[PDB]
Amino acid sequence: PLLSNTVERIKTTSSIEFARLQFTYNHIQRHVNDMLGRVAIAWCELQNHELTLWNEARKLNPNAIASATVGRRVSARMLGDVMAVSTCVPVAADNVIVQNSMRISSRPGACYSRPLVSFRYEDQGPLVEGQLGENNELRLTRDAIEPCTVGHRRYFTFGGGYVYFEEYAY
Amino acid sequence: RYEDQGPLVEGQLGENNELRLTRDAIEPCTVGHRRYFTFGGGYVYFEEYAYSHQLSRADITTVSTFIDLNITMLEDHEFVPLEVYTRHEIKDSGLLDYTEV
Amino acid sequence: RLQFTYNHIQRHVNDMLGRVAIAWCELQNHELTLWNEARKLNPNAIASAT
Amino acid sequence: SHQLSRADITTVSTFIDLNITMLEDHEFVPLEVYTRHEIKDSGLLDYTEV
Amino acid sequence: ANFYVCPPPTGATVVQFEQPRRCPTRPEGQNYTEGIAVVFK
C-alpha cells in the first residue's frame, strides 16, 4: 500500500480473460452507474424545481394544469392553496354550432371576446347556448365580454383544427 | 410571536407557511365560500369566512406533478474463471506424452 | 475483441450521454423563459428555490 | 442614477447541474497468463528438439 | 377531436400536488487504496 504526502501448490487459470472482462464490466458499470445516477439525481432535482413553476401555473389556468396533473380532462378551481376538481362531460364535435356574430345586439360597444356556440349533450337533446372555451371546453355562461376594438382578427381551436374570425364575425 | 415570551403580533397568514404583517387581503364576500390553506405540515379548512377544522396532509388525495424516471444501477457481476478446456485437459488430449512415456 | 466491445459501448454511451448533456443544457436554456415569468408571478417561491 | 456592469450583481443559478463526463478511451494491451511459448516450454521434454 | 363541458368545481373532490421527494444521493464513493503490486502466477 502507498499513501501520498497529503503447504500447498497454487493452480493458476490459463485464461486471464475473466479478470479482464471483470475490469471492462466494472469500468463500464461504474461509469454508467455514475452518470445514470447523476441523471437520476438531476432528474429528481429537476422536478423538485419544476414544482415551483407548477405551483404558479396551477394559479394561471387551473383547468389545463389539473387535466395533466391528474390524467383526465377535468376542471379545477382555486379554493385557497388547493384546487377543487370535477370531471368534464365529453361531447362529440358534430353537436356544436358556432354562431357567426360576437357583437351584442343589446349593448353597443361591448362584445364577446370568445366565440359563442350552441351545443347538445346528445344527438336528440335540447339545444343549449354557451361559449367556446380554451382547448375544446364548453362554458355555460356567456360573460367573456370586452369593449369592441378596431382590427379584430382571431383564431380559436375547434375540433381538430382552428376557426378564424374577423371584426367580431366568423 | 417571534419568541415564546414575545408580545403577540397580529397579521395574516401567507402562502406556503409565510406570515405577513399587513392585513390588506380584502375582497367582496361571496356565498358558498370554502377554502383550504397550508398550515404547518397539513391543511386548515375554512367555510363561509369561518374556521372549520384542521386536516392531515395524507387525508387529501395527492396527484403526481412529477415524471417517474426509474434508473436502476447495473448490478455488480462476477465473472468466474471459465475455460472450455483447462491447460491440463489440452495436455492430456494427446494420445501419448513423450515426457511421460 | 475487448477493445472492440469497449469502443462500441463507449462510443454509444458517450453519444447519448453527450446528447443528454446537450438536451439538458438546451432544457435549462429553454426553461429560463418560463422562469423569468414565474419570478414575476410569485417571486418568493422561485427565489427560495433559485 | 447610474449604469452597472452585470458582474456587479450576485448570480443565482436557475439551472440544474447535470454533470455528465465521457467514458475515457482505454487501450487493452495483449495480456496472456502464459504465452504460446511458455506453454510449449512447460513440457519437460519436447520430442522435436530431442 | 372531442369537446368537453366542464361544470363549476365543488369542494367534494379535493386533490393536491406531491411534495418534492428526497432526491437520491451519489453512492458513498469507493475507497480506493493505491499501491504497488507484483502478480505471480
Side-chain angles (χ1 to χ4, degrees), chain A residues 2 44 48 82 88-89 91 138, chain E residues 2-6 15 23 34:
Chain A
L2 292 185
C44 175
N48 291 357
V82 68
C88 312
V89 183
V91 163
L138 271 294
Chain E
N2 207 283
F3 284 77
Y4 297 83
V5 180
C6 298
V15 300
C23 289
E34 279 164 357

Side-chain angles (χ1 to χ4, degrees), chain D:
Chain D
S1 168
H2 58 295
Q3 68 165 14
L4 288 84
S5 173
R6 181 177 65 83
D8 298 351
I9 296 182
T10 52
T11 297
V12 301
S13 189
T14 60
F15 291 26
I16 303 295
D17 301 353
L18 173 61
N19 196 33
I20 306 298
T21 59
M22 311 292 80
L23 179 48
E24 324 83 349
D25 305 323
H26 192 77
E27 202 196 287
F28 297 74
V29 306
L31 184 74
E32 319 167 70
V33 180
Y34 310 105
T35 67
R36 174 178 62 259
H37 321 276
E38 294 188 66
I39 292 187
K40 184 213 68 74
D41 215 321
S42 82
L44 196 65
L45 274 186
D46 190 356
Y47 182 61
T48 297
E49 70 182 358
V50 161

Side-chain angles (χ1 to χ4, degrees), chain A residues 1-2 41 44-45 48 51 54 58 69 73 75-77 82-86 88-91 132 136-138 158-159, chain E residues 1-11 13-15 17-21 23-26 33-36 41:
Chain A
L2 292 185
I41 290 164
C44 175
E45 187 73 345
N48 291 357
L51 186 159
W54 279 109
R58 77 174 185 182
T69 312
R73 279 299 301 275
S75 189
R77 171 182 179 181
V82 68
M83 64 183 73
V85 303
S86 62
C88 312
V89 183
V91 163
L132 183 60
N136 295 115
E137 64 97 9
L138 271 294
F158 196 69
Chain E
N2 207 283
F3 284 77
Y4 297 83
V5 180
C6 298
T10 63
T13 318
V14 45
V15 300
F17 288 169
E18 186 169 354
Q19 287 229 45
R21 323 177 170 80
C23 289
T25 71
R26 296 175 174 100
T33 299
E34 279 164 357
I36 304 177
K41 68 195 166 177

